[PDB]
Design an enzyme around this catalytic site. Structure first.
Site: not given
Ligand SMILES: [Zn+2]
Ligand SMILES: [Zn+2]
Ligand SMILES: [Zn+2]
Ligand SMILES: [Zn+2]
Lengths: 149, 151, 151
Positions: B83
């Protein structure tokens, strides 16, 4: 190659107890799908990408499907694997050659909308779903905002 | 056999509402990277292998990068997914064609030194990072020793 | 295409500090294996599928093996990754060229029967295994029935 070729022949022919080892060849390994998050679910406004592998014996065996986009759900794990009856092999599972790719994708869309507490792939998310649903929905909404939306 | 070609035609022209299904062709799928663990991070002693997939419409979409080596970090999961803003499309994300493979790998290295508590891909790890820091750091060092190749 | 080649040239000649790239050349990536659930274990009557990749430098580096079928175990994570000595290089690990794909598959089968709480990839399962064994066995049985059983 001499070692590997002979090694593979020995495994094919005289494997150890309880063990077998073979080669497969998928019909297609580069198919992709996208599902929109449903209204009145915590995945609303999210867009979810998936991988669809068509294995050697399709349509007698099901497509092999994983989420590529992260999603917070009791039936969908950290690696994107999905627990669903139509994705499981017959005769015990619900896959048949009288269903198709479209029907399995529609079934995954339905699963996003109707999580199943009896089929956990993610034990912590399942526990939260059962014993603290408001926390689950908050987390599912946040993950949708962060990774999908 | 011929079913699949017909099936895909029908999916392409008349799919179910909310669903689409198409064929991707990556420019390259066998590219690998390695990042050395940084000084004054719990990853110091380890080396970390990654896969780098270049999608069909690069550079208009970002590279697809996953850790192959296991790593204990709130923004990286068991599939090795990461992420990070530069790996996401605008307007929410920061990818643009003025970046490239070398810059995004550098961004991942910085993410290894500076984890983000608000971007979780592993729930227990994120919680522990914020609320039980000493336990996080002990686990991160132990995972580096046990599951990464040593430098 | 032109852009990608230019980028790869620059990564080969002048990468960022601490970062390198290259292209993997695996000997084989399409190999599959199966382990039958062991008698007198909670995995009995399960059938477990695995992926086996043979790297460039086999047999001097180990085969790369993961579960495709989900399994509930302290040393096996949600991506099917396996923490086991014979899958790691010395000095810390136990891979040697006198071992082979068959013996490592047998070692994975043994690991299923004998979990190791020193090397947890799944912290919650490892604690349950140590401190609440009847509940471990019950949950391992339920996971076997739900995700690995074929009749
Ligand atoms: Zn993410
Ligand atoms: Zn399942
Ligand atoms: Zn937990
Ligand atoms: Zn390990």
């Amino acid at each position: 190659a001499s070692r590997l070729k002979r090694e593979l022949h020995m495994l094919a022919t005289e494997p150890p107890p309880g063990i077998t080892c073979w080669q497969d060849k998928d019909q297609m390994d580069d198919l992709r799908a996208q599902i929109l998050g449903g209204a009145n679910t915590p995945y609303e406004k999210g867009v979810f990408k998936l991988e669809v592998i068509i294995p050697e014996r399709y349509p007698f065996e099901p497509p092999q499907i994983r989420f590529l986009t992260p999603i917070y759900h009791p039936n969908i794990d950290s690696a994107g694997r999905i627990c669903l009856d139509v994705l499981k092999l017959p005769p015990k599972g619900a896959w048949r050659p009288s269903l198709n790719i479209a029907t399995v994708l529609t079934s995954i869309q339905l699963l996003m909308s109707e999580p199943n507490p009896d089929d956990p792939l993610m034990a912590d998310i399942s526990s939260e779903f059962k014993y603290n649903k408001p926390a689950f929905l908050k987390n599912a909404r946040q993950w949708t905002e962060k990774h999908a939306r």
